From a paper:
The norovirus capsid is composed of 180 molecules of the VP1 major [name] which is encoded by open reading frame 2 (ORF2) in the positive-sense, single-stranded RNA genome. Normally, 90 dimers of VP1 proteins self-assemble to form a T = 3 icosahedral particle of 38 nm in diameter. The P domain is further divided into two subdomains, P1 and P2.
The Chiba P dimers were co-crystallized with the purified CV-[name] scFv antibodies. Our present X-ray structural analysis of the co-crystals of this antibody fragment and the P dimer from the Chiba strain revealed that the CV-[name] scFv bound to the P1 subdomain of the P dimer with a stoichiometry of 1:1 (two molecules of scFv for a P dimer). The first part is the stretch from Pro422 to Glu426 preceding beta 8 and the S-loop, which are recognized by Asp104 in the VH CDR3, Tyr33 in the VL CDR1, and Arg51 in the VL CDR2. The third part is the sequence from Val521 to Leu527 in the last part of the P1C subdomain, which is recognized by the VH CDR3, VL CDR1, and VL CDR3. In addition, Asp274 in the P1N subdomain and Pro491 and Val498 in the P1C subdomain contribute to the antibody binding. The sequence alignment revealed that these amino acid residues (except Ile466) are highly conserved in the GI noroviruses.
Numbering used by the authors:
A (entry chain B): 230 to 532
B (entry chain A): 227 to 535
C (entry chain E): 0 to 120, 1002 to 1110
D (entry chain D): 1 to 120, 1002 to 1110
The structure:
Amino acid sequence: RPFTVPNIPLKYLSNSRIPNPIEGMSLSPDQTQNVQFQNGRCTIDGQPLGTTPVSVSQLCKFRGRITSGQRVLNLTELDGSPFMAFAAPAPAGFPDLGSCDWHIEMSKIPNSSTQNNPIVTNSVKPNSQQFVPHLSSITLDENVSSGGDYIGTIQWTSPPSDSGGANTNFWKIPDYGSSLAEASQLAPAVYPPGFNEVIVYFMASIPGPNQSGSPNLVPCLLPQEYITHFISEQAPIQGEAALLHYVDPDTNRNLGEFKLYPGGYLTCVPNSSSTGPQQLPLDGVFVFASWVSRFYQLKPVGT
Amino acid sequence: QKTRPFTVPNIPLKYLSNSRIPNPIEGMSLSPDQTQNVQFQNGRCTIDGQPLGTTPVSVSQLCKFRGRITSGQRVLNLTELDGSPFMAFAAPAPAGFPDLGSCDWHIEMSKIPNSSTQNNPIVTNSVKPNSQQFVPHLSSITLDENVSSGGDYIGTIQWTSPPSDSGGANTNFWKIPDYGSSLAEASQLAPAVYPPGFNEVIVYFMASIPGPNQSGSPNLVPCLLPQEYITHFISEQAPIQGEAALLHYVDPDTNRNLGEFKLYPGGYLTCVPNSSSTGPQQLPLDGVFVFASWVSRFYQLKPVGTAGP
Amino acid sequence: AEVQLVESGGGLVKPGGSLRLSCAASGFTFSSYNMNWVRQAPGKGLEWVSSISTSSRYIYYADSVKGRFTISRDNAKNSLYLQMNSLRAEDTAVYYCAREEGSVDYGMDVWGQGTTVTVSSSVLTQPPSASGTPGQRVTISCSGSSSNIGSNYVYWYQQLPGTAPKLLIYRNNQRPSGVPDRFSGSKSGTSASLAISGLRSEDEADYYCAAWDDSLSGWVFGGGTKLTVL
Amino acid sequence: EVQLVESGGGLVKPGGSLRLSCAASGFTFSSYNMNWVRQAPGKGLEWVSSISTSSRYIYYADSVKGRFTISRDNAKNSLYLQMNSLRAEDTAVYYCAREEGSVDYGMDVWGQGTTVTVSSSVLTQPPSASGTPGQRVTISCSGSSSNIGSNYVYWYQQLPGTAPKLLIYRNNQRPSGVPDRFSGSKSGTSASLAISGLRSEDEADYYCAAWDDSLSGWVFGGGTKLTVL
């Protein structure tokens, strides 16, 4: 009932859009820019939004049936329950990595084989028209030899096909697909809130090329283990923001001030235009300070 | 005494991870021999927040490895998942290192960070953990094939097969590889876990990894606690206040109690099966484990199960 | 769409009696904005009263009013209400309803004409007066403590004779559209100050500094500086 | 050979101190939980205290909390109780006993004891029972919700003068070497030992024992003297 944040250092926590360790914090390239992720979305009183799952083990996964010799994956839930389009862009944990191709790996469940490799490689173009997860299906790039119940994941990403040579861009989400009066019901956009404040993103890496030849970094608004805490704790909100300290666990010296908003996003004020949380160590811990106002003024983060 | 009250995460079991592979829990099981012991090195955490073996904090760090390999060669020189050095007697293996025994690991891995602009970054390979060069405790393992390009690889077990050079033994996820060293306190394995007695059996949480096995059946990996439980204890660090924590398995639709379980400080869960053909494996998977009260190792549990019509 | 707030229900009330003020909004989608009540004893400074969020989730009261007044909004009828009970001489004021707007860090950017309430049968410190000559520059200072200016942002309102106040400054040193850059704000420690350059005779007005106060969990105001131009 | 040997007790007087020792051999001392059980001349067994293998878990009887502290040194293979501010009520033979996992941590092995002399029960049993040879005799054990109601009942057999031996663990299991004439049962907050086919060698003092959740310690029956005619 008293609001809390898991007492673990950031270095040991998972991204909430890809199931990979957090590698750092950073700002969005345009610091006034809005995002609309469907995963890693949860109110701090514990309501998940979009397609967000409880556990990392169901993050960025898909599952469905496909007919032998065919390309169309009829989606279910990761446990095989049918997917009801009820307030939901796609099944739970379905990837929200927009603006890229998804080179996928999958396998049949349950296993029934006694030899051979059960893994199947394939590809998806989420900007393709038949990419309609919200209407329970996506069309793969190659036919699948053996029909069956496949569960799988994004194995690596590459720049998006049929985009006139655009780059990978993990700040965008896909188009889940809609028809007449059958619109996808998305988690709403997240906005910088004013008061000099920029949103902090937590970066992890997924394999795959990009046109700059740089690391392949996926941002997200919270670590997954924070979301799972909230879903469990369901602590009541008692203020317009929860003020948090990024505290050095060894020294008790707190390394920066942050406002964590009810909607499930975290902000800071950057010191200079160059600086920000990029420079913070990864072995600090976030600790709930007190409930505060819209109007609280954060000491800026950086050098 | 310290008295911060004990809690178990309030999420149904269906939605939580295995703690030995990063995959959702598909069921509960008893061990094939309900007297047998396990020495998993993941899923090992005390209920007061002290992880053992190689247990990582996060599902994202589970059943994963990272090392350098020089191009042309087969020796992977391990580090920790974040790049930082793994010293040659610091633990049985780097944190989150896979602990699935009695199987070949068929792995997939990529160079980290990314440097590429075209092509596929994924390299497949395999390990035979029963081989002599499988010495994670000395900070190196030897892959089966050469790696054409050398660098900093991070990767996972992509699928398993029955263990080669083992006399035709089947895949057996109840066992662990041979690794670790007595030569130092830190390199010693997390200890075996035995059924405590008292007619009690250990409850395992099962999940699935891809892989052919000898019976053409599910390829299911057992562990002792859902990982989210383990991460919760690491945060909470609730004081142990009795030799055993009584838990009820609750149907949250009605908050009905579907049965008593003892959660032991060492980090494992037990019950008493109704009979030789019944047990927790019949329970629904959408239930929630709830702390009831601290008890004795001598607490006599109501049996769990039934089987008729 | 003329953006407008109009209050009503004022008048003469007996001590110990009750009264319900209304505030009719038009020209902007009412339901999207937090609303406040700010009162003003005739010829005294600005006293924030109450504060109510878009869906009525966050409601705040001044301590001099806690237990006696009740803020509510009917988003259907584009209305803000202030029910006043156990009334006393201290409550005699002009009562303004005002709209918070996000683009100016939720400063009160649109006010109403006010309604007078007569019952019959300060924390932020400012200079009381200040004077300058045309062309010259004057600094109105404003000092608080750690729980208001020390923790929160400082806002500046200006008020011409017998008119509603006007947001001058938000976020310590930003200006709404239409506020000339002669005005500049600044904040250091538990203090803030407003600087007016190239002073003109239209700048003749009372100047108020405001800040949230986490100690009181409500707004707090300066005593008002009467700027006089000669 | 497996053996516990106890020492350092003898003819102290009130307010004084006494350090008992207990020496293990034939088994890995460090691998075992250890208790102190004392036995006033002609009276019943009283569990005193208990220490876990690596000393993490320590429990005392309500009547020694404040005055006795238990301890072990697994290197020197010894258990200790340093008894301080002793009164006359502390006069007994002090046994040290070992808990054995294969019998649900019943005390399988007791030493011969050491007598501490000083001068200047919750579970209820019959005081005595008797039976003609070959008969069946039953002894009842009754307690409350916090002991028998929640936890397993154990049974100790103490032969004429001898140190006790575990008869029944887990309500009704029989350790290796206990005839099937001895069966045990529990029902709610009560338990019963049944000896069928009675023999002269069965003449002993029988005790029941359960962990009491309230007291956070062991709790013993008053003991039943079984006379064989």
